[PDB]
Each structure stands twice: as C-alpha cells, then as structure tokens.
Design a protein around this nucleic acid. Structure first.
Lengths: 66, 67
DNA sequence: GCCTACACTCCG
DNA sequence: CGGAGTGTAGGC
C-alpha cells in the first residue's frame, strides 16, 4: 500500500502478483480511499469519485496521467 | 449460437458474437470450438492446433467456408 | 481505412 | 485467477 501522490490526499495503491495458473506472472492493481474502501477498476473508481473529478486520462495501472 | 462448421472435422463448431459497446460496438468476433470445447480466436491459432490433419490455406476464418 | 490477431481489463 | 468482452498495433 504505497501512497498514490497523483490522487487526492489519503489514497494508496497496491500491486499483487498472480502466483499460478495461465496468467501467472501478471498482476492486479488495487486502490484504497481515505475511508479505506478498495477499488479494482477504473470505472469503479471513476464512479466513486464522481463528477467531483475527471479521470479520462488517468492510467489505472501506473497511477499517473497519460 | 454454436454452429457446426461442416468444412472442419466432426464436432468442430463456430460462433459469431456481436460487440455490445465501445469503439467497435456492432462489429463481431468469430470463435471456434474443438470437439472437447477448447476455444480458438484466430486462423493461425486454429492452424497450429490442427497441424497437418487439415489444410486451412483456403479456409475463410470469418465465414467458416473454404474458398 | 479496415481487418486480423492477440493483449489487456474488469468483474465474478 | 479465469475468461468473456473490448482495445488497438501493425499489416495490408
């Protein structure tokens, strides 16, 4: 859970390696709000942040604007 | 629908799926299934699997017909 | 400009 | 972690 400096304050990001199976070696990226709720996708996070914030160019995987 | 593909060996089936949203909403993707149910998504993948048991040179992946 | 082919997301 | 469903680079 590394702080995510691109987002508003309190946010963290984590990456977790897949350990077996066909996709072994790939990873999943998670975000955690201030509240601490977990986010697993761009649409999910963009819904939660709402018309509050525009993440069109937000790269979910890297946590940077692209 | 999984349709028999008569030009492939017995039991092989083809299914066409319409994309429901995004950049290519309305376009389709074509998939093949082996007799056991293994899914294939391209001509070179299907040709690699079958090897010399079929000649796919003239096989139109999209329509499932020899030309 | 359109298509194949395959990588990747997203959510179960 | 799987895999249907979509993104898209590169060939043509």
């Amino acid at each position: 859970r590394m702080d995510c400096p691109a987002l508003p304050p309190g946010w963290k990001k984590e990456e977790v390696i897949r350990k077996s199976g066909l996709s072994a070696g790939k990873s999943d990226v998670y975000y955690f709000s201030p509240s601490g709720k977990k986010f697993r996708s761009k649409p999910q996070l963009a819904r939660y942040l709402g018309n509050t914030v525009d993440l069109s160019s937000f790269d979910f995987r890297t946590g940077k604007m692209m």
